[PDB]
């Protein structure tokens, strides 16, 4: 009953914006004080690599450690479905623990973005809800952020992706704004980032004409 | 072996005729010592009555043991707790679980129907979307329909924790462009405790 491992994927945004640096994180948790030394072994499709950086083991409140190891991945290796395996070895482990991740398999699909105004009757309130509908995308990794006149926005939340009946995903993002900003004529934008999109990005604007 | 205690369907705990129930499950239980035990207590106090289907053979050298207990509406709605004690072999201290309705001043959902965006009208199928916001707790049921009969091709997102402390979600119905252009009405029906008579409805349709 040694430590257990977890292998997390890169943030969707860091993989669609070529100028950033996506990376997989291999987290070993439940490491005892008796044997705090854990060894990481990375692989990219079986081909072991050595460019991983291990952060110094952090002390936990439940008398154990949490060790982290990260692997930068190439914009193109991840989006081409390369598989990343993290091998973990520590004395309190009969046999090393292997874990694997990689983009979901299955043909990608370009989502459509729709912006939808507030219902006329929400206009009796002080804040209105602008809606952005992203449908028909695959795989499910996606990023969504609202924006106006340059600066981003604060009051907006985005539903998790949802598996549609045709096999693709859809999600809605909700931007809340002071009713007045809306009635004036400001132009808000829905920015979406998905591999399938062109240049992995697209934007749809909504406003009161 | 791990335990999984599940709560009743929102729809079930809101319609009296229907019968809500809490489900207890046991994942990863080998063929060796499958035989289990189930103890159900309500806020300490107990009662003996919890049907228990057999160990449905599984696709990973294990089984899926499920234990269901029928509960009383207002008891669930009135934050009652429920305990399930699973007694096994590879379990020295047979894992237990407790669950109850969410705490906090209930809040009434506001329902908003949104028409398809005009450019989606070039596809041969459109999206009718239903925004359900400002509700608490998150237990809720939403379904679409037209002409008495219920629609089928629709999807509802999970409740989302908003910024002000309430939840919201969206429900997307897909209808053939022709049915929409023709002017047929569609309805979003929401069931939730904080709603008068636990139910409200909002119709949507191309105004002629």
């Amino acid at each position, epitope marked *: 009953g040694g430590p257990s491992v977890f292998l997390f994927p890169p943030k969707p945004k860091d993989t669609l914006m070529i100028s950033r640096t996506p990376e997989v994180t291999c987290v070993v948790v439940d490491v005892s004080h008796e044997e705090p030394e854990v060894k990481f072994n990375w692989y990219v499709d079986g081909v072991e690599v050595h460019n991983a950086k291990t952060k110094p083991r952090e002390e936990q409140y439940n008398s154990t450690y949490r060790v982290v190891s990260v692997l930068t991945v190439l914009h193109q290796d991840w989006l081409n479905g390369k598989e990343y395996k993290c091998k973990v070895s520590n004395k309190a482990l009969p046999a090393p623990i292997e874990k694997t991740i990689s983009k979901a398999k299955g043909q990608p699909r370009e989502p459509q973005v729709y912006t939808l105004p507030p219902s006329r009757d929400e206009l009796t309130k002080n804040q209105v809800s602008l809606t952005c509908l992203v449908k028909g995308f695959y795989p499910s990794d996606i990023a969504v952020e609202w924006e106006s006149n340059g600066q981003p926005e604060n009051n907006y939340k985005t539903t998790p992706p949802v598996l549609d009946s045709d096999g693709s995903f859809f999600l809605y993002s909700k931007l809340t704004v002071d009713k007045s900003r809306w009635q004036q004529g400001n*132009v808000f934008s829905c920015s979406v980032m998905h591999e399938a999109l062109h240049n992995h990005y697209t934007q*749809k604007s909504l406003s009161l*004409s | 072996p791990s335990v999984f205690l599940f709560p009743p369907k929102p729809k079930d705990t809101l319609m009296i005729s229907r019968t809500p129930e809490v489900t207890c499950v046991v994942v990863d239980v080998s063929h060796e010592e499958p035989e289990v035990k189930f103890n159900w207590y309500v806020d300490g106090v107990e009662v003996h009555n919890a049907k228990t289907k057999p160990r449905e053979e599984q696709y990973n050298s294990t089984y899926r043991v499920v234990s269901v207990l029928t509960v009383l509406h207002q008891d669930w709605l009135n934050g009652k707790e429920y305990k399930c004690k699973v007694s096994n072999k590879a379990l020295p201290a047979p894992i237990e679980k407790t669950i109850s309705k969410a705490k906090g001043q209930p809040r009434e959902p506001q329902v908003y129907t949104l028409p398809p965006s005009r450019d989606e009208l*070039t596809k041969n199928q459109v999206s009718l979307t239903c925004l359900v916001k400002g509700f608490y707790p998150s237990d809720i049921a939403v379904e679409w329909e037209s002409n008495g009969q219920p629609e089928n091709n629709y999807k509802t997102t999970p409740p989302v924790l908003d910024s002000d402390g309430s939840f919201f979600l969206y429900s997307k119905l897909t209808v053939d462009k022709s049915r929409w*252009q023709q002017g047929n009405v569609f309805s979003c029906s929401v069931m939730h405790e904080a709603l008068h008579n636990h139910y409200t409805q909002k119709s949507l349709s191309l105004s002629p």
Partner: antibody, heavy 123, light 111 residues
Framework: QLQLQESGPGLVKPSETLSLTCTVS??????????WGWIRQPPGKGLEWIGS???????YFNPSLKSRVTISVDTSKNQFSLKLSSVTAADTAVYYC???????????????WGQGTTVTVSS | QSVLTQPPSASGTPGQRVTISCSGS????????VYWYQQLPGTAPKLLIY???QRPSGVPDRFSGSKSGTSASLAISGLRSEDEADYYC???????????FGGGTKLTVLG
């Protein structure tokens, strides 16, 4: 208020590729509430839709001739453009650039049209 | 099934009232909004009616649009001379997935 002005070589020799541009004034394509497109009309016959484009890039073409058309926008200069390749005698007409229908995201009507521009495929 | 057909020509007489039809299909004029543009000799077409029968502010009440079945029609009342031009109907055609226009209708106020 809002206006669209076509710009382009009044002439194009066979097999070549036509190239026009549309400038908008009193309205910023960047607002993102409307689509913009091109419509041509051979002197004799009637009107024909070619394509529409959204400020973000996404464009819609006419199946009759998409394989040989190219549309693009430049937010900076606030204008969109057209490119018709392998021009023959058919592709000879007046090229208008209009904004799509009065309603936001309209994709089937043009409420505001450009002055017009002739394009003869001479030799 | 894939193209609107209007009368090649019309013509009337001042003060009168005329109608121009646009015979279409279900894949188009029968499932989408119809548009009507006016084109006075050597000019960029002018939007006359949108969404079957809406008149964009700046268009005479005499101009009206309507649809029914797989057809639509424009109707001019109180005809004048400044009305003899060419008129066209247009809608989206889900079969071709593109905008489409009719052939056009002449119409010349006789006088």
């Amino acid at each position: 208020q809002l206006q669209l002005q076509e710009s382009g070589p009044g002439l194009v020799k066979p097999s070549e590729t036509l190239s026009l541009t549309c400038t908008v004034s009193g309205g910023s394509i960047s607002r993102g509430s409307h689509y913009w497109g091109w419509i041509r009309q051979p002197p004799g016959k009637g009107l024909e839709w070619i394509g529409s484009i959204y400020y973000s890039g996404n464009t819609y073409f006419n199946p009759s001739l998409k394989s040989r058309v190219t549309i693009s926008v430049d937010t900076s200069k606030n204008q969109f453009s057209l490119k018709l390749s392998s021009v023959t005698a058919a592709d000879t007409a007046v090229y208008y650039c209009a904004r799509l229908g009065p309603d936001d995201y309209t994709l089937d009507g043009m409420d505001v049209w450009g002055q017009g521009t002739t394009v003869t495929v001479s030799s | 099934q894939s193209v609107l057909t209007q009368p090649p020509s019309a013509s009337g007489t001042p003060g009168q009232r005329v109608t121009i039809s646009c015979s279409g299909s279900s894949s188009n004029i029968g499932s989408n909004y119809v548009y009507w543009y006016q084109q006075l000799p050597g000019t960029a077409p002018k939007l006359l009616i949108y969404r079957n029968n809406q008149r964009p502010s700046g268009v005479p009440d005499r101009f009206s649009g309507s649809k029914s079945g797989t057809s639509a029609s424009l109707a001019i009342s109180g005809l004048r001379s400044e009305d003899e031009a060419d008129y066209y109907c247009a809608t989206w055609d889900d079969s071709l997935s593109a905008v489409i226009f009719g052939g056009g209708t002449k119409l010349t106020v006789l006088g």
